[PDB]
Symmetry: D3
Subunit: 94 residues, 6 copies
């Protein structure tokens, strides 16, 4: 994808983690309060898969929008998932 493009992934966890950290939330001044990929963890699931990078916006998890989520809630939403997770993203770096 190009920056700005929507894309979706079915991401399998490794070590029961998606291998990303997130930044943002409505409680934050992070732009518009969105949830963004802060970092892909070395040798983690996201990195091995290769489609998600720092800067991508996480729009939804398993069919549910993250709109209105505080940081705590976004993290919890990502954790409260099974071994394969459906993620909807916008490609960052535009």
């Amino acid at each position: 994808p190009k920056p700005g493009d929507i894309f979706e992934v079915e991401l399998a966890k490794n070590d029961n983690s998606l291998g990303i950290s997130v930044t943002g939330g409505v409680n934050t001044s992070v732009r518009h309060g969105g949830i963004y990929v802060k970092a892909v963890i070395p040798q983690g699931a996201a990195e091995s898969d290769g489609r998600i990078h720092k800067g991508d916006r996480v729009l939804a998890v398993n069919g549910v929008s993250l709109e209105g989520a505080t940081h705590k809630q976004a993290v919890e939403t990502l954790r409260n998932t099974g071994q394969v997770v459906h993620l909807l993203l916008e490609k960052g770096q535009s």
Copy 2:
């Protein structure tokens, strides 16, 4: 989804089980012979994922309709899959 809506999931097994029991089949008097989720097994894959609930109808597995399946046939169709399974469902009533 709301009751009646179509949804799809890619569900990873836990210890080779999707963690759902089903009821129904053409051989039964259940509704019109359809395959429905009887229970989401505690601690299982379907429960962790959080999208599938008791009463949802399973319409297809890995791209093949369950039409005409007996109960036994549906159970075996669900078992005879790999580690991640594509499921097409209709959301049940609350």
Copy 3:
């Protein structure tokens, strides 16, 4: 698709009709009480498209299951759509 396979189409109406007649519904003795394609109307939209054939089962319209529909209800659901309609189907026999 082969018989039994799930497929979907986005079908544009010709002169406000999808060009399919249906058979079945829970008030009939058509198998499983399902809604099936009775005919692909000559010169109509479904015929021109080429993917839908007599005997295919219509599972959903614009994201909403036809589960439990009477014949009349199914016909209305098809008719109460805009110009392009999303249809979910099961490929029929022979």
Copy 4:
């Protein structure tokens, strides 16, 4: 869909209009700057289709995110499309 659910539509224009008006954008004082459906025009494309309503958020158009878009920019993004437009939404009216 339930409020908060992601959904997508392929919507055909009527009289070269999708038959919805929008509110919001980065510059505006509305809802985190996101783009929301303000109204569905009577007899219009979106109304006939029946899947989009006031309050839904428009996440993307033809594969491209509306993220960071101003009002004018969003309104034009919607206009510079062809006869059928792919829309990604979040169901509103919690």
Copy 5:
């Protein structure tokens, strides 16, 4: 999409044309015997839609691969469709 990316479009015809011309086929010496977009016709459907460009590869039409098609067969496959057509493409080089 970036060059090499898969993308899909539901394209409504304008004046009964998709507004694209193609090059290639197993009877030509075009690379891989593939079918490529030769031109997008000014003011046509593809151009208004904005997602398809010269050099993109057409992988499939309405669910069917163009693998092994001669040039005339590819053209006919494109023509022998309804008012809205599902196209699977690979993004070409710019």
Copy 6:
């Protein structure tokens, strides 16, 4: 699917393998340089899943076309993936 149909799968690895061996690539004399399933490994991931068979063509991996791939490039593309891999295929003859 029928021969020539497009299908997609989300395939989970078993013991870090997709359970398929492929043949072809631009450097080979196989077909028109495409990447094809040579075998599915007994008791492996692809076999258990049941949708991919010898002769199917792999068109893309995780959203990126295998156009122009040498064999070694194709294999590396398959390997440089996470635990669940999105594959786009054309159903082979028979």
